[PDB]
């Protein structure tokens with residue numbers, strides 16, 4: 001249908017993920033929930049914690065059912081543990097339905113909730129394969145498609161910055177909202193249904209090819225992850241990219257620690273030298289054999305605005321490309337300014353330029369193709 005009612009249903013603080021409002025339990029208890037395409041568990045704070053403004057109260061819900069088993073979930077650096085159960089859940093600015101869903105009641109955690117955050121739980125939107133304790137714990141979105149009869153698809157339009165900066169965007173559950181993107185939507189295959197795994201076939205920095213065996217770009221996987229902030233790149237790819245961006249931007253010289261994500265670079269306000277930083281093009285495998293298309297990243301996307309309240313007049317930024325030993329993550333920084341369709345029903349992810357994009361006087365983020373290729377299924381790791 002029209003998805004008018006779901007537009008602008010997402011909020012957030014920069015670097016602390018995007019969240020949607022949800023209700024859990026009878027009568028409904030409202031919580032803000034992190035939207036995470038990089039995990040498969042729906043979990044909510046359900047005991048006091050110094051950084052939680054609210055938490056789920058099982059005893060106040062006539063529909064809670066305890067599953068009498070616990071669950072522990074470690075992420076990249078944060079973790080939680082809790083009791084599993086089920087309860088009735090809905091999304092007030094999503095479709096007007098109620099699903100009985102698995103819920104992990106978080107009763108202890110480590111480096112998970114963030115001070116000042118606004119969210120109280122997390123909604124892992126990926127596949128059952130990566131769910132904890134194991135794949136028999138049906139993820140929230142599988143429940144929603146099974147029980148209500150919504151098409152097996154959602155899309156995400158993460159809009160970036162309009163006190164840390166406020167962000168917003170839209171999560172369209174059950175379809176594609178044509179007013180949230182411009183131009184053509186290009187699909188890449190979901191390689192394997194676990195994370196949302198895709199295949200990158202070529203990387204360019206300022207039109208200049210990185211010239212690596214394309215297997216290195218997906219070593220040992222590449223995923224689309226709304227729950228990670230940065231572009232994360234395997235060791236070798238990272239070093240080659242950081243070299244290419246150093247050279248195209250060599251007129252100014254920056255600390256070791258800038259490029260390690262350890263230190264801000266600051267410029268007197270309004271003096272940010274955008275034009276010395278290159279654009280980055282990631283070509284992704286197409287649906288048609290021997291075709292690819294590319295998405296193009298501006299420096300405005302990979303240099304994250306971050307404020308020092310002291311030197312209060314400057315514009316400061318953190319480098320939001322960073323080194324991985326667990327594969328490529330196309331995180332928030334890559335998804336912002338694009339409209340991303342998690343087409344689960346047809347095992348593909350589409351990209352299109354977003355209605356809320358990040359244009360420059362001279363350069364523009366884009367989604368373009370086709371470009372003819374070969375040995376693209378060779379770019380996958382085994």
Ligand SMILES: CC(=O)N[C@@H](Cc1cc(F)cc(F)c1)[C@H](O)CN[C@H]1C[C@H](C2CC2)Oc2ccc(CC(C)(C)C)cc21
Pocket residue numbers: 016017034036038039040073074075076077078079111112130131132195223225227228229326327328329
């Ligand atoms: C930053 C971060 O962790 N974000 C989380 C969500 C998240 C957001 C937050 F604000 C605080 C957190 F503690 C966790 C993502 O969900 C990470 N997604 C993938 C990225 C990457 C994959 C390997 C490429 O590495 C791992 C490692 C573990 C897990 C969790 C499960 C094992 C249970 C699936 C997920 C992932």
